[PDB]
Structure formats: C-alpha cells, structure tokens
Subunit: 370 residues, 4 copies
Amino acid sequence: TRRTAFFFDELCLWHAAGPHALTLPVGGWVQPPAAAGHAESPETKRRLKSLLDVSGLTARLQLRSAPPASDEDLLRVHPAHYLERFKALSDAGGGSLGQDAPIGPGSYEIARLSAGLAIAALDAVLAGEADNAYSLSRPPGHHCLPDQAMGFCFFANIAVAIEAAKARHGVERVAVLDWDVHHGNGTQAIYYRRDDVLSISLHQDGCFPPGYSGAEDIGEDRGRGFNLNVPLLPGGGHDAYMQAMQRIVLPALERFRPQLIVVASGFDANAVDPLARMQLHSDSFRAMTAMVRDAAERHAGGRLVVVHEGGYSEAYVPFCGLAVIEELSGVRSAVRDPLRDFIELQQPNAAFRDFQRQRLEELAAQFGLC
Amino acid sequence: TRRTAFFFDELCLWHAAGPHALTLPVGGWVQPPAAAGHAESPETKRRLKSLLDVSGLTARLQLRSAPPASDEDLLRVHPAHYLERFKALSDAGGGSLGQDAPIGPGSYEIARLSAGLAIAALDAVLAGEADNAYSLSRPPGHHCLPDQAMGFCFFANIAVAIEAAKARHGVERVAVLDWDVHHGNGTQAIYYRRDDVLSISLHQDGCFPPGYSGAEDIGEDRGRGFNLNVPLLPGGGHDAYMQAMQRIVLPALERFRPQLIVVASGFDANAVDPLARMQLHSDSFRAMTAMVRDAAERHAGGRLVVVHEGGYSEAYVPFCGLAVIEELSGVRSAVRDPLRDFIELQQPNAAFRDFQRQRLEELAAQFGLCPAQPLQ
Amino acid sequence: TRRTAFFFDELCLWHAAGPHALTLPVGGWVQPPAAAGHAESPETKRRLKSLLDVSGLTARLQLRSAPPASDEDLLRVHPAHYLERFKALSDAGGGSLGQDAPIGPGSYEIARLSAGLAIAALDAVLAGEADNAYSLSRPPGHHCLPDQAMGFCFFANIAVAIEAAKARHGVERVAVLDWDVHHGNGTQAIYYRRDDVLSISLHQDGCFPPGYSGAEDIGEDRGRGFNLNVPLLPGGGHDAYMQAMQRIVLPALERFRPQLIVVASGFDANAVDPLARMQLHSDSFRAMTAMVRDAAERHAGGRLVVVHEGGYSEAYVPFCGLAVIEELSGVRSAVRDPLRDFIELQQPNAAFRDFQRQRLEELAAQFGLC
Amino acid sequence: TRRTAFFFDELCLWHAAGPHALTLPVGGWVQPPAAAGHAESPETKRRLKSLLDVSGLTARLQLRSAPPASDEDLLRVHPAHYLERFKALSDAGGGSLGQDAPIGPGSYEIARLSAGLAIAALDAVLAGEADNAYSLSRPPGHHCLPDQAMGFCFFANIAVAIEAAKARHGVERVAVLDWDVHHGNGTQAIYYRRDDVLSISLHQDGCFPPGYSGAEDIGEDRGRGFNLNVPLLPGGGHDAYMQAMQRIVLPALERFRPQLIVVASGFDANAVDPLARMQLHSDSFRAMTAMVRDAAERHAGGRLVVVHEGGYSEAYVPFCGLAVIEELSGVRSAVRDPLRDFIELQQPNAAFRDFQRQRLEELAAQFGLCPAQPLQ
Ligand SMILES: [K+]
Ligand SMILES: [K+]
Ligand SMILES: [K+]
Ligand SMILES: [K+]
Ligand SMILES: [K+]
Ligand SMILES: [K+]
Ligand SMILES: [K+]
Ligand SMILES: [K+]
Ligand SMILES: [Zn+2]
Ligand SMILES: [Zn+2]
Ligand SMILES: [Zn+2]
Ligand SMILES: [Zn+2]
C-alpha cells in the first residue's frame, strides 16, 4: 500500500447556489424544482465521502484538512477586485458571478477553503508527507479564469495550487491531466504561453465551453507544444479513453518528464451523467488513475495529486471516485460497482470504436507523438 | 386549428417506487438519496403538465381522463397470474416485479389507469372525437412483456390499447413509431410475427436492453418486414434523428399505409438525460412530430396518438414535451426553450454526422427501403 | 350542493425563496438542506390541489383563475415605492424584503397573481356568480403591512380584495375571521380604526408575531370593538377552537351582521405543523367552516370567501383543506383522513380543556359577549 | 476537560423506509412526496454530525464506532423469530414490521449497528475509557418491545445495551431518563417489574403512544416505584421541563443512587418539531444535560451515556444535539443558536406555567418524592 492523503472539509459541502433546475436558473419558464436544485450539488460530493466512510477506506487514508487560501495565494492568479466582487455578492446572499457561475450565501469563504485544500494537497506531496493525495475541492476550479468565474468554478484551484507550490518548493515541471469531461479552459488559458506546465485536456468535443474542440490550440510562443486538447466524439466510453491515454497522454508525459502530476479529476464522463454524453464506468477511472500513477512513478518520484472537479450523477459518482482513491492508495475495499457490467454492455460498437481510434491516431501524429 | 385531446390524470403522478438512487435499488453499497429517488419520478411528468398549464397550452387542448383498463383489456396481453402477482405486491407496499421493474404501494391501480389513458386516446381518435391525441401514460409501457415487467414498465400500454382498438373499431393497420431512446422490446415481441402492426424503434445502440442493437431483427414469418430497428450511435443528435426519419421511418410508413399511427414518445434522447447519451433538443422532437403528423394526414386521415414513455431530465423534458404538443395542436405558445441554442453548439461534428449518415444509408439499403417522396 | 368557486393558478406554485432550512436562511451555521427548502413551499399548496383532483372534488367545483392585481388595486393598500422595491428585488433574483419575508426570482408577478385571485373571489361571490369561494392565494397575505412585508406575506391579499370590493360593489360590513394559527397583524392594523370591517384572529398565544397575545387590542376610536384577538394557549386542539368559535366568534358575528364573511384560512393549527403547537385535525377545520358558513347564511346571504394563508405540513394540510372545500360545496368525497383518529387521541385532557374553557369564558365577558 | 466518547457510524445514516409523507405510508389518499419521505430521515441526524464537524466539536471528542450487536446480545431481549422475520423483510427490500415501524432494504444490518453503538457506549463508560458518551444510534430504540417493533424503533437499543452491560460488568443500578418527547414504552415494559433499572419518561401527555398519560403506572411488584411517567401538557416548554427535572427527576435519581445514568435523548420536544407540540430550545436541552451530568457526577462517578432517539426537525435538531454534546464535553463552540431568542418569546404565559407547575407539585406528592437538595 502507498500513503495517500485525503484532503476534505465538511464546509465545502455547505456551498449552494440559489434555485436552479439542473443548470437552468429558476424563473421565467423554469419552474422551481420540488427538491433537486443546481446540478453542482453538495450530494454529488457528499455521497463520495459517505461511501469512502462506509467502505472503511477512509481508515486506510491519511485524512487532512487545510486552512483556506490566503489572499497572497489567491492573488497569484486573481485580482483584488475579483476577490472584492465575489465577496460582496456572497455577503449579499449570492447570485450570478458569471455565465453558469451562480453562488450562494457564504460561497466566498467556502471557495477559499476549496482552493486551500488543493494548495495543501500539492504541498503535502512535494514535502514528502504522502506519496500521493486526493483533494475534495468543492466548488471546482478548472473553468475559472483569472477575472471570470465560469462553469460552476469561482477560483482557479489547480492554478492557485501550482503557483503556490512553485513559490514554496520551486518545482520546475508540472503536468496537469484534465479528465473532467469538459474542457479545462482555465488551466489552458493561464499556462498557454508556459513550458513549465504541460496542460492536457480530454473532453467531449464541443460540450463545455459549447462548440469548443481545440485540437489545433497547442499553446503559443514559449508554450507552443505544452498544451494538448483531445476532443473525443460524444458517445465514447472506455476504449476511447484508453486509446487517448495510450496514444496521446502517456507519450506526452514521457516527453515532458513532469516532476509532479496533477489530475483535474471530474467524473462527469461517467455513463449516467446529465452534463455530458460519454460512457465511462468506475474501472475506466481506475485504469486512468493506474496509468497516470505509473507515469508519476516513472518521472515524478510518484508525486501525484488528484483534485476533484465535476461529476453530476449522485448515484454513480461515488463509485467512480472510490475507484480512483483505491488505485491511489493500493487498497481494495469490499465495494462492488453495481452498474459496471451494465455499462460495459452499452459501449460503442466495433465500427464506432475503430472510427474514434483512427481519429486519435491522426491526432497523435498531429502532435508529433507517433 | 386541429383538435388535440390530452389524456391526463393526476393519479398517474402518484405512482412511486421504493428508494432508488437513479436506477439503483437502495441497499448494500447504494446510499439512500436525500431527496431524489427513482429516475422514473413523478416530477419528470408533472413539470410537463405544469408548463403546459402556465404556457396556456392546456386551455387550448381537449383535456380528458378515462376509466382504468379493465381486466378484459389487460388480459388480451397479460395473463391473470401476472395481474394477481402485481396486485399482491402492490397491496403489500410494493417491491420488485423484475429487474429494473420496481413498484410501490397502489402501483397496480395506477398502472391500470395509465393503460386506460392509452386505450381511451386510441379510441377517441378512431372515433373522430379529436384529430389527434397525447396520452400522459405513467407508468410507461414499451418494455413490458406479456408476463415480464421490465424497464420501469408494468403493462404493455400501447399493445393493450391496440388490441382494444382492434376489438372495438376493427382497425387493420397500425404503425407504432418508438422514439423513446431505448429499444421498444415489448412492442417488438408482441407484434414480431404480425403484419397488422408495423413496429419501428429508433434507439441508442446497446442502451436498454443493454447490448441490444437489433437491425437484423425485422420480424418473422407473417411479420417479416414489419419490425424495424434503427440503432443509432451513442452521442448522436438532431441530424442523426432527422436522417433516420427521412431515410428509414417515412419510407417504411409509406409502404405500410397505416390507418392509425401511434408514437411511443419517450424524451430520454434529450441532450441532458441521465439514462442515455443522445443530443436531442426540443426542436428535434417538434420536427419528428411534424413528420409523423404529416404521415398521419397522408395515410391515416390525420389519426395520430402520442403516448408518453421515458424522459428523465426534470429540467428539460418539459420543453421537449411542450414542443410535441404544440406541433400536434398547431398552437405555438410564448415558451422559448432556454437550452436550445446551447445544445445546438454541442452537436456532432461534420465527420461524425457523415459517419452516422453513411450507416443509415446502408441500413435503408439493407431494409430494401425505396427513397420515395411523400405523396397522397 | 352549493355552487363553490375555486380560484387557482398554477403559477402561484412557482413562487420560491432562496435556500432556507425551515424558516432559517442558509448561511452562517445553517447548512443548506439536501432537499427541503423554505417552509412556505410550493408542495404545501400543490398537494392540496392534487388531492382535490384525485378525489374528484375539482369536478364538482366552479374552477376559475383571474388576472393579476392591477396597480390600482394594489395601491389602495400599498405605496408605489413598495411595489418598486419589491419588483426590483424580484428582478434581481430575489432576496429579503423583510423580516421572515424572503422572495425569489419573479416573486413580484406571482404575488400580484395571488392577490388577483383573492380580489376575483370576493368579486364573484358579491356578483352572485357563486354562493361561496375558495382562493388558493400563494404567497399568503395576512401578516403583510402596507409598507412592510412580513411572515412570508408580500401583499395584504385580503385587505386588497376588500378595498377592491368596496370600490366596485359598495359592501358596507365585512367580517374577516382569521384561523391561521398566527396573528393576523396585517388585517388588524389596516382596519384597526374602522367599523366597516370586523377583524377576528384566533391564534396561538405568542407564536407569530412572537410574544404577541393581543386580547386587550380591540380597535380604537371609530374601530373600538371591531377587532377581536383570541390568544389560545399553545397545545390546544379541537375543543379549544370549538369553544372559541361558540363563545366568541359566533356571538361577535351575530352582533356585527356582516354582509360578507372572508376567512383567512391558514391550516397551520393542524396537529403536525412545524410552525405552531396546536392540535387540530381535518374535522376541526370542517366544523369551523360549517359554523362560519352558517353565520354567512344567517347574515350575509351565504356570501363567504375562504382565502388560503399558512399551513406547513406537506402530509397533512391537504386533508385539512379538502375538508374545508367539502363543507363549502356540500359535497363529500371518498377521501378519509388517515390521521384523524390518531390526533383525536392526542387531545388535551379534561383539566387542560377546562382551564382553557374558563379563560375563553373570561375573554367572552371582557368582550361583552356573555 | 472531560473526555466524551462520540459513538457514530456513517452506515446508521443509510437506513431508510419506503415512501412516506411524514409518518403516513404512501398509497391510497397519501401522495408520494416530491422529496421529503419518512419523518425519521437520515437528514435529521446527518445535519447534527455536520454541525459537530464544522463547529470543531467532533475534533475535541473521542470519535468511535463499534461492531454491530451480536445475536447473543439481541436475544437477551428479542426472540430468534423476531430476528428472522426482520431479516427476511429487510432482505426482501423492506416493508412494515408493525404499525409505525417501516423498514427498508438492509435495515436489519443497520439496526444491529445502531444497537451495537449503544452497547459499546455503555461499555466504554463502565470501562473508564471515557467520562461520558453520546451514541448516535439510528434507527432509534425506546418504543421497541421484545417481539413488536413500534414508533420507528426495531430493536430495544437501550435495553439491549443494559442487559449486555450487566452481563459484562455486573452493574447493579442503572437509571434511564427518557426526554424524547414520546413515552419510552419499550424501556418501561421491559423493566416494569425490575428494581435494578429506574425508568423515567418525560413526555407530552397522550402524544405517542396516542392517548397514553401513565402517571399511575409506577411499576409493579419488585419494580413498584422504579418507573415514573411525567405526562406534560401539550404546549409546554422550558419552564415545564425545568420544573419536571427539579421536582421529579432529580429527587427520583437521588433515592435510586444510580451507578450509571443513560439518557434516551430525543430532540422532538423542540419548538418546531412536527411530531409533538412542545416548546424546547437548545438551552433547555443544555440545562437538562447539565442536571443529569451533575447527578451522574454525584452518584455514578460521572458515568453518563446519552443515546440519540427522536427529533424530526432537520433545521433545529442540530442545534439541540450540539448543546447536549457541548455540555457533556465541557467544550463551548462558537455556534449561536439562531432560533433561541425567538422560541423564548413563544413560551407559555405565567398563568399556563403556574397551572403546569401546580400539576408537577401534585405529581411529586403523588409519587412520594421528597424535595431534597443535591449532595454527595
Ligand atoms: K477535460
Ligand atoms: K502550457
Ligand atoms: K425506441
Ligand atoms: K410487427
Ligand atoms: K389568526
Ligand atoms: K376593525
Ligand atoms: K420520554
Ligand atoms: K423499572
Ligand atoms: Zn465537468
Ligand atoms: Zn426510455
Ligand atoms: Zn400562519
Ligand atoms: Zn420521539
């Protein structure tokens, strides 16, 4: 077994937007839901923590919290006026900070804590306190721009954590693998002209931001070649992702030689997620974690941090998150995923798999990875 | 104009299974949800009715209920021992009538009413009481086999309605277009060797029942050529469905000359549904309804019945159902679908569209379907 | 059977405040609920409508909607600046209009419709279109002051309806019986110096507004004697209310000779309500309705309007509301209240009943009604 | 200081009955709730744990779980056929184990764990591992009879824990103070003819079981004088409970000289609970806990165990439970109860307080209770 730190704070589960039906603000033609609320709900993360507890896996992890992100840490990425505007709206009982960026009362303090967990997770792994770590950072981060909240993200959690780590530890090469089903536009933008951070996003082609594919966006100037977008066809599942990992991600990491790998781990590529159209099961997430852990072992002395991002199935995210944490820790709990065999039967047929495989081969060639 | 009957009963919204997380029975490693419950929830149909009300659509429809299905009607399809078993379990507070077929307390009476609405909707249209009809039949029907509940369906609503219509009116040719995103396996099985019902299912390849495609299953013996499965690739959206409609569905209806068209209208092909991976928006459903209404006007004297089946997005199903009912009635409300433009941007790219289009062309050829143009 | 109009609009069920746990705004130490939300929820009224439908009673009523209250109607009670402030907050996605007065997006238009239903219900009965009427006016009205939202009420529904009726029909004597479990402070204040409206409130002593009893507040000057508060001891049930009706309410109505009776019908005196401590069952509400209908028949030519106010038990309000509507219409549905016999067993004992009875006798004497 | 053990297991929050509206089984005229479900919901205990966490209280406690109750432990109270019946129903997806005793899938294992936490909490305190303990035992226990589940209780948690403690430690005198707002009928029945357990219940007169008061039920034969019921008038609040504590509970404990005090701590006497009509606030619970902790310090070497029972306000139970745990541990968090001042203003008036006070004075006399002052 490996020593896995689990960064968690109950307060992160207390962030909540005003009334929404899925992602639609209530009002106009949108009736208030009788129960549900915004897709980015506490239950889509709480149920992961609950399952970690009931499985007993929590007892085999190093459980940690952290202080909230300081102004100094936040200001490496975000302007003081952004902090001010966010705080003011949060103090006024919430509202809209951006397009698809709704906040609630006290969301400002809670978002600082989310960012703080990510900072602390990178710190712990670079300090040798754990071999690897998982940070349950809610609200999520990977769509957030320096001065623009987006896609349910209010601070750029991973970028804040990276800039803090560079300041404190002087790490030179960080890879960020973003397997949240949506494009990691925040991470991409921040590091677009940088060669010290390799940003890779696997995402459903055109999902969010809507209509964005991005294969041709490989970074610029000093960063040219240090950003890779893999826009997978909607409907893809396990094979599409395994092919992307083998043909693009692993070769890209091999060439870059990261000293630390950070995963933007959304689970919204799962087969029952409302916010995308991909077909992953819990063993897909297990396999991706195994592959990136192996890459971390080969290049980064094992130094791997997984940061929770998206995932909107209350029923199924917990099984997917559990699989990741089992793989990080090398511990196998008694949990059996009850949907795995069902999802295996729903996968793309051979003709569709081949179609997607050929596109990935072409993309690997475009990237110079063949 | 057009006179659209809306068969609805509030009691259909009172059916509810025991605790589930989406489709997973609670227990073992599945934690009870704090609110949600089984995916087939009352709210996924109630919000449609609410939106019909606030938009002013309900006021422009012929709002009707019906008596529940009689034992006679149900026994045309289901055995007495099935009825007995269902009733006993329903009287005992519910439970599992099969894999993915959970019921709750009183679900037997409510399922009889759901079937009754479908029977009545077909009756009304064949009787000339309305030009067309929509039946909010919950619980749904299209997966139910004669002696096996399946896929949240407990009676074979559409088949029960058809067999009742044949007994009462003597209709000879009925087409059932099933655009619920899952395979209409109940309808297929019941009519598999029959030429008096053309069953067509558009579905996500391999979704539910899991791993079933079915393109080669075209019916047998007397029914050979009277069943068509169109297994669309996961991830497809508007174009995939329009192409399926134009290349397969419309030619198949033209050849069959239905006297009545029934739609098994699930909305779970919508772009945010948890139970499938397709990318339809409300205008996709509107366009499919326009096409089938036109087919009904040409062959069947306008006789078209749409029967609610699946659809699991509480937020988005209402907009999709509203679009269908607007198209049936010829009434356009002030409702603007707030996700339409967003979903448009998420559609498959040209390479993926072409790939799916070529498969549909091959499938139309495999079916021996001639690309005729609509005519009277 | 009588001709009963049922004023209802689906849009009234679409009003919804921001996140609350019961009556507590989310934030600080108050965790967002996983489902529930504000106590004044759509479900506490929707379930009444649903049960009316499933029972078939809806088919035996005269179903009506109405246009929203005009500015002219609203401005008889409320200032233009109140309307403006309410609209602005509603257009900004909601917030707090007052103490225990939270609104949501579009609540302004919905509150106008609620008030419009009440206006229309009084109009219909005074016009002879129905013998009596029930108005499902959500959000409720009876705590609202002219320039101060309070207690989940944003317009003074009943007062707006009365002033509209006086302008259109010239009715001279209206009685308002408020059996919502909380004090009808809005109605009381507006008509406190008026003898053309007799305001009676039955309420739990000190419940809401908190600590208010009010027996000594009988109106002033021209209105002296035309306001009656009956502060019932917490814990009382059927007998306490029957005694209040017989010893105070009926004699008060007999003396006043109303030409129209309006009931502010909250159901929050029911035995499982979270927002009060009283023990009514559905036959209590049936009996109160029978008594006030009889009073309306004796004095007002049958002219009775019941306006929905409070009631916070999703499970039990529907049975209580159904009983009222059965009594108004003279139709008895097949519905059997499944909690009635249970609640009958929980009632105050003889010593407690006698204690409360003696207090009501003393209060009847104070009011000059002995 | 003070070392407080907090017996908690996440799995206790996974017990869930089939659909109910508050306490009403869904079916017939009872519509399924859109969210809520049975009043005995996980959220009414989860929000306590969450608040303990965010307030920093959990970090200052000894957080412990325990193994589930063994068959041996359960069979001290319950028959094997009861265990068998419960397990069978739990394995079949749940249902009704009696009137107001609904279970769900896996509830058997979870109820065993709830009982196990109570057993372990008594063990820990008798073993000197902690000064006192709180056990979040869900599902609750105090209504359960040996062969009859009742009032949302499926095993007699406190009685099972006591009989296990007697077997393991040989404790001779245990007092059970039950301030859950409903009558502790299970505890009363089991120990009704026993002098080794003093059972005291404060409850709303006639609430649950419905119409039961019970002041004249003081135990029989060997147990005569070792059961006390205090049926408080509906509508009572802080003063009623303080008066009951001072005039009845403390004198009764003084005479009994318990070696261990167990509290059946329901929070359903809180001022916003749907399942009773009483008016307690968080400081009422704090004050009761201070009084019983002091009694435990004087008689029992500090040995006090609080076992969670009822409490049905999701919003308000957390503040009440937090106050109890603060008092057990001697730790005061930064939490300020946001309803405390409001509830203070709603309290019975002086006439009503005097009326209830006089009844308690009469009841203390009827019980032959001497008003002694606390001493060591
Ligand atoms: K991504
Ligand atoms: K880069
Ligand atoms: K289909
Ligand atoms: K066929
Ligand atoms: K009142
Ligand atoms: K007056
Ligand atoms: K008690
Ligand atoms: K005893
Ligand atoms: Zn995402
Ligand atoms: Zn379906
Ligand atoms: Zn009220
Ligand atoms: Zn209780």
